[PDB]
RNA sequence: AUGGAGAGUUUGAUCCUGGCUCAGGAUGAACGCUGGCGGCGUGCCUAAUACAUGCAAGUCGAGCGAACGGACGAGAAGCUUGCUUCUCUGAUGUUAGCGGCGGACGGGUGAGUAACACGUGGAUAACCUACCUAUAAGACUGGGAUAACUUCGGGAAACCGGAGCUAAUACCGGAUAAUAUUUUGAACCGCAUGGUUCAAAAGUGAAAGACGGUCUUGCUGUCACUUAUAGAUGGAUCCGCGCUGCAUUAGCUAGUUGGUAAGGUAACGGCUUACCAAGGCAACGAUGCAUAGCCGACCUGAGAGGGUGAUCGGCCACACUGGAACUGAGACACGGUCCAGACUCCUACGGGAGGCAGCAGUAGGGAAUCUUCCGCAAUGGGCGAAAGCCUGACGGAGCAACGCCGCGUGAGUGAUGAAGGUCUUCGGAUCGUAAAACUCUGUUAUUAGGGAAGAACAUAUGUGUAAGUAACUGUGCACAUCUUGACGGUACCUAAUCAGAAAGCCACGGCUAACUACGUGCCAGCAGCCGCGGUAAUACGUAGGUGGCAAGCGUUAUCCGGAAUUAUUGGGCGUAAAGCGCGCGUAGGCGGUUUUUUAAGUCUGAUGUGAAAGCCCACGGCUCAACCGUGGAGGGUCAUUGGAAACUGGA
């Protein structure tokens, strides 16, 4: 993180375009299954791309309105 | 210099002034010595005015000097004439 | 005209020259539990003639600063 | 109005004629949607309180924020909270115009007041949220004194409550006094809404 | 009386205990999707990080000399009487400079500060105060300089020197004046120290002129000047009480605590020094460490409480870092000075310069916070006699759904249940009066016209009246008139045209309102908790429908609530977490019955104060509302004072 703390962040949605050195936005909220994963990566912010093919609850996955 | 002046209240494009005795160095809308009245120049197409004559005369005798608008307001209320008459006939 | 605060208290030390320390006792109430609890405050007062002695109940009155920490003057010895 | 939706579907959902005619419930008195027919589930207590609140809110054609604010201000009045809330909802210019009968529908009266065909004490009022008070008069704009809709609604002689005194010749109504619970619709249990806003 | 809801989850099942979690409210928010408008607010919380550039403090010619400038209007005719020089007059004006006042306000910031910093209540017989107001008395008589300017010399610049000359409301001597200082006497009074008044004397310094009127240089108006005493304002000091975490911080203090003398200060004082003494603080938490600007208030809660200290007001502190003083009524001074330090810049390399936590803006940091805008028209401030100048205070506009409030995205009729989507038991059901179509409206929007208030004034011009005058001009007051708008041709109003440009977000297993079909098949994926998904998934993704909201809806972060889960209100310790292994005993806490007395607690009345804004109640004004305004009510463990004696405390 920008404060030099290293964390594990879950990537929500189906399919992602993230690799090493990608710049991502991280919010709170742990994944109960994953022990040491205590944060989430916001979709549709900075490098992270929106979920492709998502149509319901798009704002939660950073997908634009298809129209 | 003690002075009698208008401190602004109300809202944007809707001023409403309180008439206050305050030190000249104090901020406008800030510390005051004592309020004596109110002055609304946007009421019923005629400036509404309220003043306490006793306090106005006390401060005029003490040495507080009004501003232009406060002097006009006190003249309209007749306080200036009474102060002048008392000073002349003291 | 305007008077100055006067307190009554016991003398708890007089080793200083012309100075006696007076312990005024009060009872502040606990702000949450409301119980009465003792509160002592020591006052440094001027004793010009060293009349007051360790133990006697004396009376003090507030004055202008007289020393680094003396703000009171002995008025009378209520008891002894 | 602000909610531009199927008032028939809303009436069917809430089991009440928002228009007051009953046409919506005449044929299909059950809820809309794929599961409308053969619907037999039982509402919980929260569901019942919510349904009562929604009945009143959609009856008066208001949004949730304004409805809640009106309920809050009514709570500050002296008396029974629910009755005060109901009379305050009745006092709205939309409700007053609709009761006077210058329109055949509450939404139509809302559009009239919004477009400014109404005057209160002889002055224009564009805001349907306006809260009328006893002793005031509601008139109609001269440029719109001969509107087909308004004249037809006036011709249809509807009942005028006691708290309103109307004269159709001048198209002039008067808000005489505050309404009463009996005058206000009895299909609403205001205690349920009070409890809903309690939790 | 205005006020208080619970639910899921430990088991095969149960009751209890117990934590975890959820439903509410809030925000200077950020992010994701989406996004029409108006009104009122709010908008660098991070780096007290560094800052390009512009602007944020000047004004006074009615204090002063000088310079520039040149009307009105002189002289010769160049025979051009329309153009001309110097031998003039030279007015309306402008300025670099001396001098006065203002640069100590206004604006920014919260680093430091755990402290009489702040809040509340008091005290100063220990204090200071320019400008302002009132009263009284004065403003007399002389003098020496210097800036500017001219000249010579040295500089890239910053700018420097030497010589010569000249002003003042600049500076200085003397004269008279004191409630100020010394001494003596007297009168009265108080909270130790002391305070007020009177009478004698001795020492003793103040000042200024400018612009006008009458003109008799005599009188005199306004402003300005000096001394004294009061008022007002502002500031200073002291004190009770309140105001934070840690003992895995227990000792701290040597000018330290007191006295004497002196010095010093507006002022008292170890404030400082010399001497004498050994005192002072601390388990009622000293010292140390950590963190922090404090408050009015703000959020939440039924309350008690808990959390916070943005915007606005008060108080404090700071101005690259540290120290110091100068000038001044006032500073140890944000856009002053000196010194030291870090950092940065310019240079002709000789040497010079700077401090945005002012308004914009740049770079950087950050999840994140705006225009290098307009005007002094309003209010306020500085200077000026005034017009007026200055004013990034302020008043406005610009941007941002950041918040709150208001209005839209249409309304009536409309079964003939149209097409089409989804489901189906293949009959139908549903989207659905929804749609289509007819009728209506123009809030909004486009076009074209009209168009506020906010503006009071000041000044100037006319009169009237009042103190003074010997009388005017003037001065105070009163009534009239010309003129003054950045916003802005904006708000608002009118007329015409069109439903036409203006709906999205989340959710639908229980909590919790809302269910079905396909795809998938412990995978992909969901998830706040319990959990869901391995072919019949209302829990994953899509679709139809439905629910909640709606120009917003969700997510994340943080605070209060629910949590009686630190329990004063309002919990416990046999077996759930919890009685020290047990004595002896210090401080503290608590304490048997009666009588008298005190009034510290306790109870009751009066007075002052608890700013304003805010919350609550009422009323009034914006078309409504938010918002704005005005009254009321509230808020102290507050203080002074008078009363009662049952209980606790004292005798
Ligand atoms: Mg700090
Ligand atoms: Mg509670
Ligand atoms: Mg300065
Ligand atoms: Mg600066
Ligand atoms: Mg700045
Ligand atoms: Mg960045
Ligand atoms: Mg609690
Ligand atoms: Mg046990
Ligand atoms: Mg035992
Ligand atoms: Mg108040």
Q: What is the 3-state secondary structure (H, E, C) of chain A?
A: CCCCCCCEEECCCCCCCCCCCCCCCEEECCCCCCCCEEEEECCCCCCCCCCCCCCCCHHHHCCCCCC
- How far, in Å, from the CA of C32 to the mean position of ligand 7? 14
Report the candidate in D47, D4, D46 with the shortest Cα–Cα distance to residue D31. D47
Nearest nucleotide over every DNA/RNA strand to the D78 CA, judged by C1': E2
Give all chains having 3 or more CB-to-CB distances under 8 Å with chain C: none
Neighbours of C39 (CB within 10 A): 11
Nearest to D61 by CA among D114, D3, D15, D131: D3
Phi and psi at D70, nearest 5°, equal -60, -40
Which residue, among D113, D150, D104, D151, has the nearest Cα to D131 in the 3D structure?
D113
Distance of CA B28 from the midpoint of ligand 1 (Å)? 30
Assigned CATH for D89-175: 3.10.290.10
Provide, in whole angstroms, the distance separating residue C38's CA from nucleotide E595's C1': 30
Angle at D81 between CA D75 and CA D84, to 5 degrees: 90
Of how many residues is chain C composed? 80
Q: How many domains does the structure of chain C reveal?
A: 1
Structure tokens at D12: 């069917």
Q: Which position has the token pair 């962040």? A: A9
CB-proximal positions of chain E, under 7 Å: 2, 4-5, 23, 31-35, 39-41, 105-107, 122-126, 130-135, 191-193, 231-234, 237-243, 256-260, 268-271, 278-282, 284, 305-306, 312-315, 365-367, 378-382, 393-397, 405-414, 417, 422-423, 429-434, 439-444, 453-458, 466-467, 476-479, 493, 495, 504-507, 511-516, 524-531, 541-558, 568, 588-590, 600-602, 611, 616-618, 623-625, 627-630, 637, 640
Please give the distance, rounded to the nearest whole angstrom, from the Cα atom of residue D193 to the centre of ligand 4. 61
Distances (CA, A) of C7 to B21, C28, C62, C73: 41, 17, 8, 10
Q: Which helix (H) or strand (E) holds D195?
A: helix D190-198
What Å distances lie between residue D187 and D18, D123, D181, D183, CA to CA? 11, 34, 11, 12
* Spatial distance between the Cα atoms of B26 and B24, rounded to a whole number of angstroms: 6
Closest residue, CA to C1' of E189 = C1
> What does the domain layout of chain B look like in residue ranges?
1-90
**C-alpha–C-alpha distance, residues B90 and B70, integer Å:** 24
Nucleotide minimizing C1' to CA distance for residue C62: E239
Among all strands, which nt has the closest C1' to B61 (CA)?
E133
**Hey, is C17 helix, strand or coil?**
coil
Give the Å distances, CA to CA, from A13 to A9, A24, A61, A67.
13, 15, 7, 21
CA of D67 to C1' of E550 (A): 14
Helix (H) or strand (E) holding D193: helix D190-198
**CA-to-CA separations, D198 to D71, D191, D195, in angstroms, rounded:** 11, 10, 5
Sheet holding A8-10, edge to edge: A8-10, A37-41, A26-28
Strand nucleotide closest to residue D129 (CA to C1'): E624
Q: Give the pair of three-digit tokens for residue D21.
A: 């005619």
> d(Cα B86, Cα C59) in Å, to the nearest integer?
54
* Cβ atoms of C66 and C20 closer than 8 Å: no
Residue C4: Cβ-neighbour burial (10 angstroms; 0-12, 13-18, 19+): exposed
The angle, 0 to 180 degrees and rounded to 10, between the axes of the packed helices D81-90 and D64-75 is 130
CA–CA separation, C36 vs C30, rounded Å?
7
Give the nucleotide at minimum CA-to-C1' distance from A25: E367
Q: How far is CA A26 from the centre of its chain?
A: 7
A8: tokens are 């594990």
Contacting chains of D (3 CB pairs or more, <8 Å) are none
Q: Where are the alpha helices (DSSP H) in B1-90?
A: 53-62, 68-77, 79-89
Enter the tokens of residue D176. 């005489």
User: How would you label B52-90 residue by residue, b for 16+ Cβ within 10 Å and e otherwise?
Assistant: beebbbebbeeebebeeebeebbeebebbeebeeeeeee
Distance (angstroms) between ligand 7 centre and the Cα of A32 equals 29
- Quote the CA–CA distance of D54 and D52 in Å, as a whole number: 5
Q: How far is the CA of D42 from the C1' of E537 (A)?
A: 24
Ligand 4: centre distance to CA D4 (Å):
59
The resolution in Å comes to: 2.0
User: Is residue B82 classed as helix, strand or coil in its secondary structure?
Assistant: helix
B61 CA distance to ligand 8 centroid (A)? Answer: 83
Neighbours of chain B (3+ CB pairs under 8 A): none
CA of B25 to the centre of ligand 4 (A): 22
Q: DSSP H helical segments within D39-175, as ranges?
A: 45-59, 64-75, 81-90, 93-100, 106-115, 148-155
| Residue lying closest to nucleotide E548, CA to C1' | D64
Instruction: Say how many Å lie between the CA of residue A3 and the centre of ligand 5.
Output: 26
Residue D153 DSSP code: H
**Closest nt to B45 (CA→C1')?**
E453
Q: C5 CA distance to ligand 5 centroid (A)? A: 51
Amino acid A60 CA to nucleotide E227 C1' distance, rounded Å: 84
Helix D93-100 vs helix D106-115: crossing angle, to nearest 10 = 120
**Beta strand pairing status for C36-46 and C72-77?**
parallel
- CB D26 within 8 Å of CB D13: no
């Amino acid at each position: 993180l920008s404060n030099n703390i290293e964390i594990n962040a879950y990537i929500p949605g189906i399919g992602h375009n993230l690799q090493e050195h990608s710049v991502v936005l991280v919010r709170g909220g742990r994944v109960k299954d994953l022990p040491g994963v205590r944060y989430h990566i916001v979709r549709g912010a900075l490098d992270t791309s929106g979920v492709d093919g998502r149509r319901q609850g798009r704002s939660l996955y950073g997908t634009k309105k298809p129209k | 210099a003690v002075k009698i002046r208008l401190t602004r209240l109300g809202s944007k494009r809707n001023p409403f002034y309180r008439i206050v005795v305050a030190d000249a160095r104090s901020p406008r809308d800030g510390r005051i010595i004592e309020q004596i009245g109110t002055y609304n120049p946007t009421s019923a197409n005629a400036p509404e005015i309220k003043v306490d004559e006793a306090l106005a005369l006390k401060w005029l005798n003490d040495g507080a000097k009004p501003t232009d608008t406060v002097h006009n307001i006190l003249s309209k209320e007749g306080i200036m004439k009474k102060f002048d008459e008392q000073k002349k006939a003291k | 005209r305007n008077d100055r605060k006067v307190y009554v208290g016991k003398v708890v030390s007089d080793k200083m020259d012309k100075t006696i320390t007076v312990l005024v006792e009060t009872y502040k109430t606990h702000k949450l539990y409301g119980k009465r609890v003792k509160y002592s405050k020591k006052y440094k007062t001027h004793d010009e003639n060293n009349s007051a002695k360790l133990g006697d109940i004396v009376k003090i009155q507030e004055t202008r600063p007289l020393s680094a920490t003396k703000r009171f003057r002995l008025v009378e010895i209520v008891e002894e | 109005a602000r909610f531009r939706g199927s008032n028939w579907k809303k009436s069917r959902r809430l089991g009440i004629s928002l228009s007051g005619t009953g046409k919506e419930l005449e044929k299909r008195p059950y809820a809309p949607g794929q599961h409308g027919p053969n619907q037999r589930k039982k509402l919980s207590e929260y569901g019942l309180q919510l349904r009562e609140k929604q009945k009143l809110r959609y009856l008066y054609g208001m949004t949730e924020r304004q409805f809640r604010n009106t309920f809050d201000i009514a709570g500050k009045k002296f008396g029974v909270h629910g009755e005060n809330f109901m009379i305050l909802l009745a006092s709205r210019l939309d409700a007053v115009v609709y009761s006077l009968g210058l329109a055949r529908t509450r939404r139509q009266a809302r559009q009239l007041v919004n477009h400014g065909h109404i005057l209160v004490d002889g002055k224009r009022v564009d805001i349907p949220s306006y809260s009328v008070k006893p002793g005031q008069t509601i008139s109609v704009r001269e440029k719109s004194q001969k509107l087909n809709i308004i004249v037809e609604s006036v011709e249809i002689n509807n009942f005028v409550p006691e708290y309103l005194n109307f004269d159709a010749d001048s198209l002039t109504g008067t808000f005489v006094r505050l309404p009463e619970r009996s005058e206000l619709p009895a299909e609403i249990n205001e205690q349920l809404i009070v409890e809903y806003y309690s939790r």
